[PDB]
Amino acid sequence: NLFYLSPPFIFRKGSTHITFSKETQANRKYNLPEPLSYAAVGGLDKEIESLKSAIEIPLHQPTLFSSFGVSPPRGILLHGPPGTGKTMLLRVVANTSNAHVLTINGPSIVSKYLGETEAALRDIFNEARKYQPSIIFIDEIDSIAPNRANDDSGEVESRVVATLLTLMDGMGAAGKVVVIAATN
Amino acid sequence: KFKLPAEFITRPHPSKDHGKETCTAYIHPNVLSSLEINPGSFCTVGKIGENGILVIARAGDEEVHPVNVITLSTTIRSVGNLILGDRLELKKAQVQPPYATKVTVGSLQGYNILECMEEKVIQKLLDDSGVIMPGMIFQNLKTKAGDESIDVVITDASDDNLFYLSPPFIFRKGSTHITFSKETQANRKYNLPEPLSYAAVGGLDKEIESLKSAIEIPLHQPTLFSSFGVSPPRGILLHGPPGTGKTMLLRVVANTSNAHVLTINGPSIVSKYLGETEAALRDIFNEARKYQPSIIFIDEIDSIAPNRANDDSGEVESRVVATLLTLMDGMGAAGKVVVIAATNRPNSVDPALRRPGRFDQEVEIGIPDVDARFDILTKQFSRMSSDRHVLDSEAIKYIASKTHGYVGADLTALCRESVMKTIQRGLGTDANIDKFSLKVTLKDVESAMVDIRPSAMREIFLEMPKVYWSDIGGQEELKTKMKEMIQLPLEASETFARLGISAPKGVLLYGPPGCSKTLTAKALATESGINFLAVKGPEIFNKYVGESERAIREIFRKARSAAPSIIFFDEIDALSPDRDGSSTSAANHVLTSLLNEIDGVEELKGVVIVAATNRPDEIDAALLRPGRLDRHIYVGPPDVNARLEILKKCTKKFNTEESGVDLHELADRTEGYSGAEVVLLCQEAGLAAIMEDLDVAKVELRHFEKAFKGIARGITPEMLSYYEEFAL
Amino acid sequence: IFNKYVGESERAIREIFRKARSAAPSIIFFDEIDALSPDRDGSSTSAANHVLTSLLNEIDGVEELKGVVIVAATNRPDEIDAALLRPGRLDRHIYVGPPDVNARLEILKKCTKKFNTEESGVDLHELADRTEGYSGAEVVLLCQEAGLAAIMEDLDVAKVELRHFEKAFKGIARGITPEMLSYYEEFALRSGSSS
Amino acid sequence: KFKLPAEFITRPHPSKDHGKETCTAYIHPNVLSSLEINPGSFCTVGKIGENGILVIARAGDEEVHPVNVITLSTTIRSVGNLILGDRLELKKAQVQPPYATKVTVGSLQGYNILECMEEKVIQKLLDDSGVIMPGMIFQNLKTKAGDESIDVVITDASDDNLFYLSPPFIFRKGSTHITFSKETQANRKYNLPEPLSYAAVGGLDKEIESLKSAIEIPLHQPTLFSSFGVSPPRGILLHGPPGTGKTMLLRVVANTSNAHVLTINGPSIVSKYLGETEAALRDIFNEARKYQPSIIFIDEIDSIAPNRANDDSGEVESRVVATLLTLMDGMGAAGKVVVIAATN
């Protein structure tokens, strides 16, 4: 039982009483992680519809857009009050789609000195390119791309924004990858 | 090869605390052998770098005892008050303890053992103890009735020593004189680290109960959230004014809840620099989960995780969040911890640490009220019985009534200062005095109140020059109105919650210069005491950007500390002078903040707000919108009878009776004199008297004539006008 | 919204109207529009110059405003900007008076919410005509002064007295005085007629 | 002990012709040792934050070759559009790239190679090249009887774990077919960076030729002014409302001119420590002096060089403007250096 999220049992034929039930979830005592699906997102049906369109169009069918010689609408941005289903919408987009979910964490992607921040961004976007379709989530993109007009911005913000500008405007026209940003 | 560690951890001996094991420390066999300590041999177990408990070492099971873990029977721990989590140190005992001859055994319950138990019980327990050490507790001893149990201790022992916490002895049946006692604690001369209890921190009852709920839910009933499924409240932020008792409450939770306490986080950490400290911290929360239901305290959460004002950060704030996001695992599996933070100033933590899943719950201790302070003083003074004699019960409501504004740390300070002053005056009245005849009298305490100012005054700065209604001549109408309109809704809040009355939130005092506005404000502040916080225009404003906004929001933040309470904005016309009606360039932020706050305060929650002005139309109309500050009281020039009361007060030590100075002439000649000028006329009379013949005995009418001929009054196109208009 | 801020000078009005128009029919309200934007034609010249422009550019323009009526309120109608009175922004105009004797009966009933003056004390129905010159928010003042006086006699739990309402009558003089009757009727001979 | 640079400066080979030095990157001996890139071994060089180009490492003369510099041929630089002065990474590749089967070759000019050149020329070029990657341009190849010169492009390469900006392939005469084409650019599949050119800029014709003159004469023909006894014009400023294409001009000037290209991206040089913004400017202008000719770009000059007399310009702005003034005209000399700036 220890170090196992749930203890299996080796199903064997002959005496296993397969009693079907109307419950729509696994046994509650163990509480295996419940998916955060679309039916737990109520209140934003129109907004979720718009998000769905914005994700599908660059994610699944970028090729037919790319025949026109101008890059898809890869960059989606979520903003609004800082309490209204922002990270939760990103999480549901992660769960529902079968697209490889990467993640651009704010603090943890950056180590120290040089060639580490740009290395992280290059590596993650390259992996999102190898495995397709893929979604690149940047929750609270503000914490890593401020205006550069505030005293908050230093070297690291300049690194992150330069690398993102180099990458996101470079890849395209075949990659089935979307970048979704959210901000307070 | 095995390596002997330098530190160890306490965990509970899993079996019932009886038999020879009651004085045995089951230790990892590798540790014992590497220490060259044979099983069944004596060793001293105690906190790192401190005296310890002599106990027999025994070899544990490697699958049961991790390398650093040590199990002491509850009997052993209760001697040192060792909490499960205390880091231990191990040393071999050099000399065998002596045999006991006489032993005194008593119960913490205070129940007469002679009336409940036979001495065979004490013989059994002491024989099981083997090497007696005073302070051990024998726990839950069931009576013959079966429906009861008793707690018992070695109150004293003697025989007819290095690093031993209390003098130990060896029990040998038949040769020892067992004796009963009613004493609930061991011999005071043992200087034991006595436990800490809720019988000491009493005075915050409701928050104590809420804390007990916040320990019930994550320790005892984590299973009861697997059903209902929903994420549990597994982060607590016990904020409050400094010195209110937060650290004491955390300490009582640690010692009276029987969870394992994961070691205190503290402001200190290896290096206090990013990168290095990030792993050294995660280790504390990695220690969590594995142990049976625990409690990790992160006291001073503002010093470990500061606000990140504009760029002030190592990595520690985000490191705390990223780690708490795993510490919040539980109640599906590994629901075996809760985190309790403490702080003086919760808005100075990074606000990301109060988000759901993080410290999503708070306790919010306040400032002790009038009866809270009596609770505090009673429980505190209970520690003295032979040296007080003056508490009886009364005179202590007197201390608690006159000691307004003390936060609880200041009452402890008051007690110690009274003790020190008692000793000082005892040795001052005579060259030598009997130490044990010394006793802290109400004379001592009331004298000590002079020196011990509240700690609140060093952050809540307030003048309150102590005026009374006897010092405000006339204004009977205004005293009545202030009673009605501020003091009743302040104190009678519950009755208005019953009666549905609406308290006049906001009273603006407007009137000519030199009338009773601020004088009545002060008298109200001190007479019929309430908390009374004020600000000034020239101090909320600072050269740097945004420092004025922060000041106003911080003023309201600190104002939240108590209730009932009056906020006093003297000369409010210099908080909203301009930048709203005109010159609206970029700097009306102070008005924005104040006018935002004035709405957030609830209508009868307990806080009321008073303001004053002699320039009524200079106040921005935003403040006089109803719900904000729409109530106005006029403080006009005093009438004939008020002026005579002022004259009578301020001429008190003038022998007006002997000199024939008939006040009823001055009170009418001084018509239109606005307050201060009636006072001035009496100062000038006195100077006229002194200049005539220094070493004056009395003042006389001619001096008052000289005073009158030199005083001028106010402006009638500005006074009695522009206030009559403002009345419309 | 009238205050001078980046998002209040000419923006917040547009956002409010956009929310209201985007919704089902709406009765958007403009409490004290007279005090909000004064005449500013030589008398009572405020310094905003922006909010009235936003209203003028929003109400009269391309927007659909299918389900929208802009109601407003005032106590000094002579101060309204002339750009509002004329048809095009406001084209309906009516007058609201303080409650009559029966309206005053039921406003007296409304004031009390947790008092038993009727059975114990004086009937609320008795007070119907006793209150003269007391506006809908001033019969409230009489009742609330009586309630404050109630907590002065027993101070814990009591009904009120007739003399509580009598003191309400003294301490609060006749509110609706002939001055406002005259000022209105003077303005109404203009608003009511073509003059 | 020796400290290897964290980032490296691109530079050109002294040899301008095509040989077995083409695909070779000359790196300092100590750096070769420190990454254990044994001479002759494969290494990947590519801008910070982008995929690398496979290049075969040789050594530089240890006393005249700066530690920062890798020297690359125009053919290799054409792949990633590496402009001189770009900061490159350098990382060992423990790999042997695959052999070729079919290699496609085209020409910018669109002329028929069978008509313009003999297939033995292309065969020799590829054989000597050592490596084949789509996107390479072999410039200035002479036509029949020296009629003219043509630029030849490797449009695509095909064979019937590291990550590369262009697939590496090897040429093995006879066994890899040199199939001709007419596509004047590399295959669009690859997302190879495509040089921005003046043909993409609209209008501004007279301004474009003014930029050409003031960039060409100061950098590529200074002895004409030294002959005429006048100094060269070391400065151009572009001003006009936003959105008119000012940065487009700077990027095309960077990508078209053969010079060391350095950029002060306004706030990118700024630091909160007392003298560090000024030290960034001194290092940029000394690098420009060191490697000549050099173009220094300053987009939004007004962000780092305000009026110095107005109220908000304190000591920091004064010191940054003084540094710019003294590095442009002071007790120090300029060299074949031109500074190009843009401002709204």
Ligand SMILES: Nc1ncnc2c1ncn2[C@@H]1O[C@H](COP(=O)(O)OP(=O)(O)OP(O)(O)=S)[C@@H](O)[C@H]1O
């Ligand atoms: N329709 C909804 N709108 C808002 N919150 C919802 C909704 N449905 C569920 N929630 C809950 O809202 C909680 C908080 O929402 P979050 O998106 O996590 O907050 P947030 O979006 O991260 O806010 P920030 O500070 O802008 S990142 C989640 O735990 C959800 O369970």
Ligand SMILES: Nc1ncnc2c1ncn2[C@@H]1O[C@H](COP(=O)(O)OP(=O)(O)OP(O)(O)=S)[C@@H](O)[C@H]1O
């Ligand atoms: N019943 C009591 N209630 C409150 N304080 C008490 C009480 N009895 C004694 N005190 C003492 O009051 C002092 C309060 O100190 P702390 O608990 O450390 O203050 P605190 O609230 O934690 O403030 P800090 O700034 O956060 S360390 C301690 O010395 C207590 O022992």
Ligand SMILES: Nc1ncnc2c1ncn2[C@@H]1O[C@H](COP(=O)(O)OP(=O)(O)OP(O)(O)=S)[C@@H](O)[C@H]1O
């Ligand atoms: N019985 C009294 N009635 C009126 N004023 C008195 C009386 N006794 C003393 N004073 C004087 O009244 C003065 C207070 O006048 P205030 O009206 O409060 O001053 P103010 O200029 O109107 O505004 P502030 O709040 O004081 S700055 C003090 O200087 C007292 O000396």
Ligand SMILES: Nc1ncnc2c1ncn2[C@@H]1O[C@H](COP(=O)(O)OP(=O)(O)OP(O)(O)=S)[C@@H](O)[C@H]1O
């Ligand atoms: N002929 C053209 N003229 C101008 N802009 C063009 C032209 N062709 C394309 N563009 C686009 O317009 C923009 C021109 O670059 P910008 O930098 O936006 O101009 P700029 O604003 O003057 O330069 P800044 O302010 O320093 S970023 C780019 O987004 C180009 O893709």
